[PDB]
Short mmCIF file of C-alpha atoms in Angstrom, two decimals:
data_model
loop_
_atom_site.label_atom_id
_atom_site.label_comp_id
_atom_site.label_asym_id
_atom_site.label_seq_id
_atom_site.Cartn_x
_atom_site.Cartn_y
_atom_site.Cartn_z
CA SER A 1 15.94 15.71 11.73
CA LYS A 2 14.23 14.67 14.94
CA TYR A 3 13.70 18.42 14.78
CA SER A 4 12.80 18.27 11.06
CA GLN A 5 9.85 15.98 11.61
CA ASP A 6 8.46 17.64 14.71
CA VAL A 7 8.43 20.99 12.92
CA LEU A 8 6.94 19.47 9.75
CA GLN A 9 4.36 17.60 11.81
CA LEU A 10 3.54 20.82 13.62
CA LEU A 11 3.25 22.59 10.27
CA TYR A 12 1.00 19.88 8.82
CA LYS A 13 -1.18 19.83 11.92
CA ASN A 14 -1.63 23.57 11.68
CA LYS A 15 -2.78 23.81 8.05
CA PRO A 16 -4.09 26.02 6.68
CA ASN A 17 -2.91 28.40 9.40
CA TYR A 18 0.43 30.18 9.53
CA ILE A 19 2.49 29.55 12.63
CA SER A 20 5.24 31.83 13.92
CA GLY A 21 8.86 30.83 14.36
CA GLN A 22 8.37 31.66 18.04
CA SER A 23 5.30 29.49 18.47
CA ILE A 24 7.13 26.61 16.83
CA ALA A 25 10.19 27.25 19.01
CA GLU A 26 8.01 27.33 22.13
CA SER A 27 5.91 24.28 21.16
CA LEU A 28 8.96 22.08 20.54
CA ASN A 29 11.04 23.80 23.21
CA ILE A 30 13.95 24.53 20.87
CA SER A 31 15.81 27.69 19.89
CA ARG A 32 14.34 30.19 17.41
CA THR A 33 17.53 29.75 15.43
CA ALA A 34 17.10 25.96 15.36
CA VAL A 35 13.65 26.49 13.86
CA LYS A 36 15.13 28.80 11.24
CA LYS A 37 17.73 26.19 10.29
CA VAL A 38 15.02 23.50 10.26
CA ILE A 39 12.67 25.58 8.06
CA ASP A 40 15.34 26.03 5.34
CA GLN A 41 16.27 22.39 5.71
CA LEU A 42 12.70 21.31 4.95
CA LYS A 43 12.44 23.70 2.05
CA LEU A 44 15.80 22.39 0.88
CA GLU A 45 14.36 18.86 0.78
CA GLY A 46 11.50 20.12 -1.38
CA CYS A 47 8.79 21.05 1.10
CA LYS A 48 6.84 24.01 -0.23
CA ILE A 49 6.66 26.27 2.81
CA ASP A 50 5.42 29.82 2.52
CA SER A 51 7.06 32.17 4.96
CA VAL A 52 5.78 35.67 5.48
CA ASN A 53 6.90 38.47 7.78
CA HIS A 54 4.77 38.87 10.95
CA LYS A 55 2.79 35.67 10.35
CA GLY A 56 5.18 32.75 10.15
CA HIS A 57 5.22 29.55 8.16
CA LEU A 58 2.68 27.60 6.12
CA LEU A 59 3.11 24.10 4.69
CA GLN A 60 1.71 24.36 1.17
CA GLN A 61 2.83 21.13 -0.42
CA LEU A 62 4.78 18.01 0.50
CA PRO A 63 7.40 16.68 -1.97
CA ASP A 64 7.55 13.09 -3.30
CA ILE A 65 9.29 11.65 -0.26
CA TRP A 66 7.96 10.01 2.91
CA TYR A 67 8.26 11.96 6.12
CA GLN A 68 7.95 10.12 9.43
CA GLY A 69 6.45 13.14 11.18
CA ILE A 70 3.48 13.41 8.87
CA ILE A 71 2.88 9.64 8.54
CA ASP A 72 2.59 9.56 12.36
CA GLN A 73 -0.52 11.72 11.97
CA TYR A 74 -2.20 8.96 9.98
CA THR A 75 -1.34 6.30 12.60
CA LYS A 76 -2.60 8.48 15.51
CA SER A 77 -6.06 8.31 13.90
CA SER A 78 -5.78 4.53 13.38
CA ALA A 79 -7.27 1.78 15.49
CA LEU A 80 -5.09 -0.80 13.71
CA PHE A 81 -1.60 0.63 13.31
CA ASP A 82 0.33 1.25 16.53
CA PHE A 83 3.06 3.09 14.59
CA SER A 84 4.92 3.24 11.31
CA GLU A 85 8.63 3.11 10.51
CA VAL A 86 9.68 5.22 7.53
CA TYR A 87 13.01 4.83 5.70
CA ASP A 88 14.60 6.70 2.79
CA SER A 89 15.94 3.46 1.33
CA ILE A 90 16.43 -0.15 2.43
CA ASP A 91 16.65 -3.48 0.65
CA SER A 92 13.36 -5.04 1.67
CA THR A 93 10.53 -3.69 3.76
CA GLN A 94 9.59 -7.36 4.25
CA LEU A 95 12.91 -8.31 5.81
CA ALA A 96 12.72 -5.21 8.03
CA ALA A 97 9.14 -5.99 9.02
CA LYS A 98 10.02 -9.58 9.86
CA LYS A 99 12.88 -8.33 12.04
CA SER A 100 10.72 -5.75 13.84
CA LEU A 101 7.87 -8.04 14.87
CA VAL A 102 9.99 -10.21 17.16
CA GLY A 103 9.39 -9.86 20.89
CA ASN A 104 6.17 -7.90 20.51
CA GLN A 105 2.55 -8.16 19.39
CA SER A 106 2.58 -4.77 17.72
CA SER A 107 0.65 -4.02 14.57
CA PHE A 108 2.42 -1.56 12.33
CA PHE A 109 3.86 -0.88 8.91
CA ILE A 110 7.12 -0.01 7.28
CA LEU A 111 7.44 2.37 4.37
CA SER A 112 10.42 3.07 2.20
CA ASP A 113 10.76 5.66 -0.55
CA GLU A 114 13.20 3.39 -2.36
CA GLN A 115 13.65 -0.41 -2.35
CA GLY A 116 10.92 7.95 -5.86
CA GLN A 117 7.94 6.89 -7.94
CA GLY A 118 6.77 3.80 -6.09
CA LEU A 119 5.22 2.86 -2.76
CA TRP A 120 7.02 0.08 -0.92
CA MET A 121 5.23 -0.94 2.23
CA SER A 122 5.10 -3.96 4.49
CA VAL A 123 2.30 -4.33 6.98
CA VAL A 124 2.47 -6.44 10.12
CA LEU A 125 -0.77 -7.79 11.50
CA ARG A 126 -1.69 -9.99 14.44
CA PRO A 127 -4.77 -11.93 13.47
CA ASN A 128 -5.72 -14.57 16.03
CA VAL A 129 -7.19 -16.90 13.42
CA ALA A 130 -7.17 -20.56 12.46
CA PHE A 131 -4.78 -21.84 9.81
CA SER A 132 -7.93 -22.48 7.72
CA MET A 133 -8.49 -18.74 7.38
CA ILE A 134 -4.96 -17.65 6.45
CA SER A 135 -5.22 -18.07 2.68
CA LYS A 136 -8.32 -15.92 2.32
CA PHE A 137 -6.33 -12.90 3.60
CA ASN A 138 -4.99 -12.25 0.09
CA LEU A 139 -8.50 -12.16 -1.32
CA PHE A 140 -9.73 -9.49 1.09
CA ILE A 141 -6.60 -7.39 0.93
CA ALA A 142 -6.52 -7.42 -2.88
CA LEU A 143 -9.93 -5.72 -2.88
CA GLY A 144 -8.62 -3.11 -0.45
CA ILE A 145 -5.70 -2.18 -2.67
CA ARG A 146 -7.90 -2.28 -5.77
CA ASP A 147 -10.43 0.08 -4.16
CA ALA A 148 -7.80 2.58 -2.99
CA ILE A 149 -6.08 2.70 -6.40
CA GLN A 150 -9.45 3.00 -8.19
CA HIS A 151 -10.28 6.24 -6.36
CA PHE A 152 -7.39 7.85 -8.27
CA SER A 153 -7.78 6.04 -11.58
CA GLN A 154 -10.12 7.06 -14.36
CA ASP A 155 -9.67 3.55 -15.73
CA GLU A 156 -10.95 0.23 -14.37
CA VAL A 157 -8.58 -1.30 -11.81
CA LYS A 158 -8.77 -5.12 -11.65
CA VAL A 159 -7.41 -8.00 -9.63
CA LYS A 160 -5.29 -10.80 -11.07
CA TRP A 161 -5.45 -13.72 -8.61
CA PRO A 162 -3.80 -14.22 -6.30
CA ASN A 163 -1.52 -11.20 -5.80
CA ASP A 164 -1.42 -8.67 -8.73
CA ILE A 165 -3.43 -5.49 -9.39
CA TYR A 166 -3.84 -4.25 -12.98
CA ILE A 167 -5.13 -1.15 -14.72
CA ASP A 168 -6.15 -2.35 -18.18
CA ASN A 169 -3.11 -4.28 -19.47
CA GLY A 170 -0.52 -2.90 -17.08
CA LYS A 171 0.45 -4.35 -13.70
CA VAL A 172 0.27 -1.44 -11.26
CA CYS A 173 0.71 -3.39 -8.02
CA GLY A 174 2.04 -6.65 -6.71
CA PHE A 175 1.86 -7.82 -3.13
CA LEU A 176 3.07 -10.80 -1.08
CA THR A 177 1.72 -12.21 2.17
CA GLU A 178 4.00 -14.03 4.54
CA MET A 179 3.11 -15.74 7.78
CA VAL A 180 5.12 -16.37 10.97
CA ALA A 181 4.04 -19.00 13.47
CA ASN A 182 4.79 -20.20 17.01
CA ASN A 183 5.15 -23.47 18.75
CA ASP A 184 1.42 -22.74 19.18
CA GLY A 185 0.15 -20.99 16.03
CA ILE A 186 0.17 -17.73 14.04
CA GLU A 187 2.64 -15.17 15.40
CA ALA A 188 2.06 -12.62 12.58
CA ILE A 189 1.11 -11.78 9.00
CA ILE A 190 3.46 -9.65 6.90
CA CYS A 191 1.92 -8.22 3.76
CA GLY A 192 4.50 -6.77 1.37
CA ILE A 193 2.97 -4.23 -0.98
CA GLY A 194 4.57 -2.74 -4.08
CA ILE A 195 2.66 -0.10 -6.04
CA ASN A 196 3.63 2.06 -9.04
CA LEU A 197 2.58 5.59 -8.11
CA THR A 198 3.94 8.13 -10.60
CA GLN A 199 6.17 6.40 -13.19
CA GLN A 200 5.92 7.53 -16.77
CA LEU A 201 6.09 4.79 -19.41
CA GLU A 202 9.73 5.79 -19.91
CA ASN A 203 10.45 4.93 -16.25
CA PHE A 204 9.87 1.18 -16.82
CA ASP A 205 11.48 0.44 -20.17
CA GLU A 206 13.54 -2.63 -19.55
CA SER A 207 11.57 -5.21 -21.60
CA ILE A 208 8.63 -4.70 -19.27
CA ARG A 209 6.94 -1.41 -20.37
CA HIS A 210 4.03 -2.90 -22.35
CA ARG A 211 2.66 -4.51 -19.19
CA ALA A 212 3.58 -2.16 -16.40
CA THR A 213 1.70 0.99 -15.48
CA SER A 214 1.44 3.48 -12.60
CA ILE A 215 -1.48 5.21 -10.91
CA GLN A 216 -0.46 8.59 -12.39
CA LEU A 217 -0.69 7.26 -15.92
CA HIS A 218 -4.46 6.85 -15.32
CA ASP A 219 -4.95 9.96 -13.25
CA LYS A 220 -5.61 13.23 -15.10
CA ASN A 221 -4.85 15.06 -11.84
CA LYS A 222 -1.45 15.07 -10.15
CA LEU A 223 -1.19 12.09 -7.80
CA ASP A 224 -0.73 13.17 -4.20
CA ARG A 225 1.17 10.28 -2.61
CA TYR A 226 0.02 11.23 0.85
CA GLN A 227 -3.59 11.39 -0.23
CA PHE A 228 -3.18 7.92 -1.78
CA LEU A 229 -1.38 6.45 1.24
CA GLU A 230 -4.17 7.66 3.50
CA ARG A 231 -6.77 6.06 1.30
CA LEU A 232 -4.73 2.84 1.04
CA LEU A 233 -4.39 2.47 4.82
CA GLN A 234 -8.11 3.06 5.30
CA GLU A 235 -8.98 0.33 2.75
CA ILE A 236 -6.42 -2.06 4.23
CA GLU A 237 -7.83 -1.59 7.71
CA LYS A 238 -11.35 -1.98 6.41
CA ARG A 239 -10.69 -5.17 4.43
CA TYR A 240 -8.67 -6.55 7.34
CA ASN A 241 -11.70 -6.15 9.62
CA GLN A 242 -13.76 -7.92 6.94
CA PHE A 243 -11.20 -10.73 6.88
CA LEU A 244 -11.55 -11.21 10.64
CA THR A 245 -15.32 -11.10 10.65
CA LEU A 246 -16.69 -12.39 7.29
CA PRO A 247 -16.39 -15.64 5.32
CA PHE A 248 -14.82 -15.22 1.86
CA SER A 249 -18.18 -16.25 0.39
CA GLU A 250 -19.45 -12.79 1.39
CA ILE A 251 -16.83 -11.00 -0.74
CA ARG A 252 -16.58 -13.73 -3.35
CA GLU A 253 -18.85 -12.21 -6.01
CA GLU A 254 -17.28 -8.78 -5.57
CA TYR A 255 -13.90 -10.46 -6.02
CA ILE A 256 -15.14 -12.19 -9.10
CA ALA A 257 -16.58 -8.99 -10.55
CA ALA A 258 -13.23 -7.28 -9.93
CA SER A 259 -11.11 -9.96 -11.60
CA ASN A 260 -9.43 -9.81 -15.01
CA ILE A 261 -8.80 -13.53 -15.45
CA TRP A 262 -12.02 -14.75 -17.04
CA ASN A 263 -12.74 -15.75 -20.66
CA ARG A 264 -9.26 -16.37 -22.01
CA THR A 265 -6.72 -19.13 -21.99
CA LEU A 266 -4.06 -18.70 -19.33
CA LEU A 267 -0.87 -20.40 -18.31
CA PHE A 268 -1.00 -22.00 -14.85
CA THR A 269 2.07 -22.92 -12.80
CA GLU A 270 1.11 -25.05 -9.84
CA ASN A 271 3.99 -26.64 -7.91
CA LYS A 272 3.74 -27.92 -12.63
CA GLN A 273 2.55 -26.01 -15.74
CA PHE A 274 -0.63 -26.28 -17.78
CA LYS A 275 -2.99 -24.17 -19.89
CA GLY A 276 -6.67 -23.57 -19.36
CA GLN A 277 -9.44 -21.11 -18.49
CA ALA A 278 -10.36 -19.99 -15.00
CA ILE A 279 -14.08 -20.63 -14.62
CA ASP A 280 -14.74 -19.94 -10.93
CA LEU A 281 -13.46 -18.98 -7.52
CA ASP A 282 -15.00 -21.40 -5.03
CA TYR A 283 -16.44 -20.57 -1.59
CA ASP A 284 -13.10 -21.49 -0.07
CA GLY A 285 -11.18 -19.18 -2.41
CA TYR A 286 -9.73 -21.96 -4.52
CA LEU A 287 -9.41 -21.11 -8.20
CA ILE A 288 -11.39 -23.52 -10.35
CA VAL A 289 -9.57 -24.07 -13.64
CA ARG A 290 -10.53 -26.09 -16.73
CA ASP A 291 -7.50 -27.28 -18.69
CA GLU A 292 -7.26 -27.71 -22.45
CA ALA A 293 -7.72 -31.46 -21.90
CA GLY A 294 -10.97 -30.46 -20.14
CA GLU A 295 -9.97 -31.67 -16.65
CA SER A 296 -11.13 -29.36 -13.85
CA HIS A 297 -8.44 -28.47 -11.34
CA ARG A 298 -8.72 -26.85 -7.92
CA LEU A 299 -5.86 -24.53 -7.01
CA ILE A 300 -5.30 -22.73 -3.70
CA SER A 301 -2.22 -21.07 -5.15
CA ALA A 302 -0.50 -20.86 -8.49
CA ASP A 303 0.76 -17.98 -10.53
CA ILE A 304 -1.56 -17.10 -13.37
CA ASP A 305 0.44 -15.91 -16.35
CA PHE A 306 -1.08 -14.15 -19.38
#
């Protein structure tokens, strides 16, 4: 398995070349027989590996599971992410992330196949920013996720403030941002990201189906989870850099243009509940809402509910 990944990584690195069992054995410094057992292993787990006499092995296609060894290739080309942790299943990437950030200033993410048609990821970031900048993080990151998903969707992907991503009438993503602070100030940000990758409508069902969707449902081509992950990390990094450098006012109109909350009467639950229309997002990223009694409200956070 330590073996599994190194071989797979080696295979992935070497695309679209074939690589001999001997070359693999020599590169990893393991027995030719170990490589043989590892090659079948990988194939057993659904890796499409072509093996031909005299030439060796060729990774043709990854299966719908996360492999540490290939994710590492994405983080080696990243300025932001020092590493990733990849699990088969766990309860909460967020809990794991929160546990992992203690005693370090690392920036990294945690992926789990199961929490395999969805992407469960938590991202740990170390922004040295004021408390007055925290709440705009959701606004930037929402655009990142929206952009990434849109590259794969033939349909318009939209943001529902503050933390949901929709394609038409189906929620395709929901994220959560948590913050950890010191005696001084901000120790970390932990952004928990849940995305529906390849569900069919039948894979939701339970009273929810008419308002859930997946990326694949809006992608005529087969969704390559790795291709999507790569795009998602690039957009996250990009929008994170924006967050650190730009005022929300610079992305505000884009945010507005990408939002699906205008021109209808919504239910607002503050901290409690009232109905109205959202009429603006202010320069500070507060939602401006006009109630049915006509009183304008200014919300930094509430759940909007259709």
